[PDB]
Structure 1
Amino acid sequence: SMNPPPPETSNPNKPKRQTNQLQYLLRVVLKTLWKHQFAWPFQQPVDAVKLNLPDYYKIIKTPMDMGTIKKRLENNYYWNAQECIQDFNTMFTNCYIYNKPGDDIVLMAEALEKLFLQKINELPTEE
């Protein structure tokens, strides 16, 4: 099987806005997670071909990853901060769905998720 196309990251027909929460999600949340020692599996769409995971996209029907999230932020694709938060949550839950408790890849995701939740708890109030 080939890989699916990646999630959309730009749509010139969508309206765009700047908000302090979206700025924070890029400047603080995405950039901090990106540097984490276990970030690398989550920095781009899961390449099921290269990883030899022929059933990945039979099980995961709503793919998400931090490369896509980053591009969405940088393209002003999100109108609401909640959309971006949902995408991070989709990324983590996809890993937990595909895999099993205690797998190394799951514990990697859990470490990123703990950091994510700390940074989301520090999300600024809307201006």
Structure 2
Amino acid sequence: KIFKPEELRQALMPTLEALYRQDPESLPFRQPVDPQLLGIPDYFDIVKNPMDLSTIKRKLDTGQYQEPWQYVDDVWLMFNNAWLYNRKTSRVYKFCSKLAEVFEQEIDPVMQSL
């Protein structure tokens, strides 16, 4: 009912590492979206709450999650952002789907041990 930041961190970091380590599939997700650099300048018109892996890492590192479902919500926000923004035929969309499949596998037994 009260989760200490260092125990969320130690429980959840390996699930975040599972996403990061997927190469090339994590590469679009490792840093905040820079719409001008990426040549997707309308991104913030579509995606109102951006999220990426390095953001989620920083949140886990600084104790910003009071409970583990908040971490799951940020991961899924990142995925929902990609599935909204990109066409279903896009390699970014398909990479997002692969990362969600990996996440589902890794997070389910972790959320159960919590």
- Does TM, normalized by the shorter one, top 0.5? yes
Which residue identity does 2:30 align to in structure 1? Q
Alpha-carbon deviations, 1:41-92, whole Å to 9, x = none? 1011101111011100000001111000000001111111011100000000
State the SS of the aligned residue for 2:74: helix
Please state which structure has a larger fraction of its residues in helix.
2
Instruction: Name which of 86, 103, 109 aligns with 1:99.
Output: 86
TM-score (norm 2): 0.89
Distance in 1 separating the partners of 2:91 and 2:5: 37
Q: In the aligned structure 2, how far is the partner of 1:96 from the partner of 1:81?
A: 23
Aligned-pair identity (%):
31
Within a 5 Å distance, the mapping from 1:18-57 to structure 2 comes to: 18=5, 20-26=7-13, 28-37=14-23, 38-57=25-44
Asked if structure 1 preserves the Cα contact closer than 8 Å seen for 2:9 and 2:60, the reply is: yes
- 1:46 counterpart SS class: coil
> Gaps (5+ residues) in structure 1?
1-15
Q: What is the root-mean-square deviation in Å for CA atoms of aligned residues?
A: 1.6
Task: Name the TM-score, length of structure 1 as normaliser.
Answer: 0.80
Structure 2 alignment gaps of length 5 or more:
none
